[PDB]
Structure formats: C-alpha cells, structure tokens
C-alpha cells in the first residue's frame, strides 16, 4: 500500500498517519520529522537546511527529492510506505511519476487558513519522537508530559504565528497545486484520490479515513 | 540544574567544573573526557578522534552530539547535568534546540587571547583521575608528580604552542559565536547567562560562580 497526504501546513495530517501505519504495517515518510532529524543529529543537511526552514521557507527540491529517493530504497518500505508532506511541489510531483512510482490513494484534508493560525498555538511536541499533541484538541494524558516518555513537551520556535503564516503563503502557491495534479492523475487511473474535512476531530477524521480506506 | 560552560582555550572551565558537580550534585558531560576515553577503549571512534584532537581540531559535530546524547539518557542525568566543552559550535547548539533540550545556566569564562597559549602550554595532567595541573599558576605540591597517586604528569600532544594557536583561531571562527548566541537566547528568557572574569585566581572564579548558581 502506497498513500500520499496532502494539506495545508497544520491541517493535522501528521496525526492521522500513525493510525494509516499500523492499519497497513508500512512506515511513514515524513520530509518535515527527516529534516528536524538532521537538525537534531548535526547532519551536513541539517546544517544547510536549519536557516531555510526557520524562514518558514520549502527546502529545494534537489536535496528533498534525494532525501526521499533514499528512504523508499529501504528495506522497511519494499511492502509500502506513508508519504506526509511529499512532495510538495510540482517538480517534486513530476520526479516521482517520471521515475516510475505511482501510488494506490491521495488523501486530501481540507482545512482554512485562519483555523490553521489558531489551533498552532495550542500545537505541543516531544520534540525528541515527533509525537505531536494540542492542548485542546489531543491533549497528552498529562498536561506538558510526553505519554511514552513522561518527558517535558516544548513548543517548536518555528510554531511563531509570523512563521505560520509564511508556511501557508509558500503552501498556496507551490503545494496547493498538487490537489489538480492528483485529481488529474485519479481521472487517468493511476491512483484513487478522496477529500476529508480536517476541521472535524481527530476521531471523526480518522473515521472518514477508516471508510475510505477500507 | 543544567548548566552550559562557554570560554575561549585554557580559560579554566574543566578546572571549575569540578567544584559545581561536588557542590550541585549533577554529574559533569565532558565531550573532551568522553572522547579521551574512546582513545583509552581502543575503539572506531577512539581510533577516529586521536589525531584530530592531538592537532588542535574540532571533532565532527555528528559525532560528539550523538556522544553527549548516549550520555545524557543515563538516570544520573534525571536532575541536571553540567555540559564542558559542549556545545563548541552553532550546529552542536540548534541541535540541543531542536531536540528540545534547555538550560537553565550559560556561564561564559573571560580571558584574553594574551593569556591562552601559555595557560595551554603549562597545563600538566593526571589521566587516570581527571586531575589537571599547571606547572606555575596552579602547580602540583611535588614537581612532575600527582598529589594523590604520586604518578608522573603527563602533556597532552595538542598542548603546544604550535597547535593552542591554531585552536584559538577555530575558537574564534567556529566557538566564539556561541556567546552571541547564548545572550540572545537568555534576552529571550529560555536560559541564564553570566559573564566570569577567569583571569581571577581558581578560588576566586569558584567564589563568582557560586554565587551565580546559588
Ligand atoms: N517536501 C518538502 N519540500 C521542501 N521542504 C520541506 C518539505 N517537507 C518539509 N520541508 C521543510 O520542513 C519545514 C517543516 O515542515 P512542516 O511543513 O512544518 O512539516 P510538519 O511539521 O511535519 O507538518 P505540519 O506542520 O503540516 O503537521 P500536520 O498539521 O500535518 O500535523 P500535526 O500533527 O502537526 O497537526 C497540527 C496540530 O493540529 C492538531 N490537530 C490534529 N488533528 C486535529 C483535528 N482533527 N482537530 C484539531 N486539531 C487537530 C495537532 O494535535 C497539532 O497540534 C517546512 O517549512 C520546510 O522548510
Ligand atoms: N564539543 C566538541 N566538539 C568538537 N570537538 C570537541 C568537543 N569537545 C571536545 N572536543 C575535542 O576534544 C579536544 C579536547 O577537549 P578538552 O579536553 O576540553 O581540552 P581543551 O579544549 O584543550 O581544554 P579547554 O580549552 O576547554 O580548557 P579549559 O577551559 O577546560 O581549561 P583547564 O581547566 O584545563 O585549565 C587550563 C590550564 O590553566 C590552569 N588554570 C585553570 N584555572 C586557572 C585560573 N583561574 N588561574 C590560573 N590558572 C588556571 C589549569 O591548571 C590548566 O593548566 C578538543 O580540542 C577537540 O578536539
């Protein structure tokens, strides 16, 4: 099984990938987690991409395309893999269709702009796993703990609303986009595309994603 | 607690780190002791390091983040720790960030590049214990000897003049930019900093800093 996520930077795709991982037993490839992980281990791409992603900026796709090209050519993906948050633009698209990979479903979450900017200030992680809570909306069983770990949650720096509403302009212009390229794709038959209300809970969503999916 | 030692070479952060773990109850992270003791092992990274260190040169950041974090997941890192000689460059320190790791203290020693390279020079050390010396500002009671052990002193290979200069210019290109840094992390309220004048005798630098700490 092959899935790709689609969606506004904070529209809680990421949630929903935990539950699409062990439905199909398939690992999640997350730009966003791999990128904060060369940051935190001192990589060379963590030094070249820390700046870029401070400024709320998308990487290039040269270093993003390798990065993934690298991480499906793993053994623990030979079976399937998650996408979250590739690609995010047009080349990035069109140099995985070009190599040959197609995948079985594009998952859509809909979710405005101005809802975005407000549920990010609630938006608490443990930043060592990636897992991510909200204060409100899922909270961690105890408030600022990690649930596996019991470690302090932080709030990532890059979660400033200035930060936010620069994600979103980069996101209108260059991933929006990837909706008709996808729907394009579907019509061909090369994929299944559906679209999901992200506005709901996290339990309605992971609901409509359950029928969808099957 | 946990606390960060900032200082240009030779400016005595090993000597009073000492003082703050028998004091604080915190164990002290030495990434200098840490890679000392690969060597001693005969391990890759030992057989990695050796050469590096003895010229006067960083260690890659990869390897001495993944070091500190093997170091810092032990239990006797629950209730803080004191990091010397870590962070030394701006990649070491977004990776703390972005792992979520805080302090609470950033004591930066201040000494002027005059007195580095015959701090450096002079320095004579016990290996086994950890217990550092210097042959005119801070001597052994028996000359050549160690005062408890009463085994001969040893010089570490990159304590030369030839090299201790070379690392005052990485210091200033690489290490330097920490202090910077630090102080707008603390203007922001994530840390503490405070400056310490290390020209002061040993018993007046422990004195300035407890009072610091409390
Ligand atoms: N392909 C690429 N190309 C180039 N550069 C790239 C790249 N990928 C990454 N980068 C670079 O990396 C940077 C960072 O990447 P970034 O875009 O920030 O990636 P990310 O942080 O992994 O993803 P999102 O912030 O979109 O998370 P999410 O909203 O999908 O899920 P979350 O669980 O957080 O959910 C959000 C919040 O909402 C809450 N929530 C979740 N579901 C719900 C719900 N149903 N109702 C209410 N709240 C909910 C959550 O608890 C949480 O608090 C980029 O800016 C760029 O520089
Ligand atoms: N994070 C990292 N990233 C990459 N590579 C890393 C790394 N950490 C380590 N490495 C590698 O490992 C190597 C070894 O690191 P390390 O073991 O820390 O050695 P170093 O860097 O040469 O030592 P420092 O410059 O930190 O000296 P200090 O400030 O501790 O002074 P000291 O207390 O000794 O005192 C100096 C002398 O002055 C004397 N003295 C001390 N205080 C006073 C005083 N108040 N008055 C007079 N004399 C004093 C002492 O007796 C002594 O003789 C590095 O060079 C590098 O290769």
Do not use: W
């Amino acid at each position: 099984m092959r899935i790709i996520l689609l969606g506004a930077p904070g529209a809680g795709k990421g949630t929903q990938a935990q539950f699409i991982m062990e439905k199909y037993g398939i690992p999640q490839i997350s730009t966003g987690d791999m990128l904060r992980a060369a940051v935190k281990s001192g990589s060379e791409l963590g030094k070249q991409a820390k700046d870029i992603m401070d400024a709320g900026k998308l990487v290039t796709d040269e270093l993003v395309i390798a990065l993934v090209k690298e991480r499906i050519a793993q053994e623990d993906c030979r079976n399937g893999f998650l996408l979250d948050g590739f690609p995010r633009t047009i080349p990035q698209a069109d140099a995985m269709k070009e190599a040959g990979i197609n995948v079985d479903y594009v998952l859509e979450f809909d979710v405005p702009d101005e809802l975005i900017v407000d549920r990010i200030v609630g938006r608490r992680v443990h930043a060592p796993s990636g897992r991510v809570y909200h204060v409100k909306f899922n909270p961690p069983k105890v408030e600022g703990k990690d649930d596996v770990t019991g470690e302090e949650l932080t709030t990532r720096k890059a979660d400033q609303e200035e930060t936010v509403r620069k994600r979103l302009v980069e996101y209108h212009q260059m991933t929006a986009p990837l909706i008709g390229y996808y729907s394009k794709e579907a019509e061909a038959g090369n994929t299944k595309y559906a679209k999901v209300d992200g506005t709901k809970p996290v339990a309605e969503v992971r609901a409509d994603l359950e029928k969808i999916l099957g």
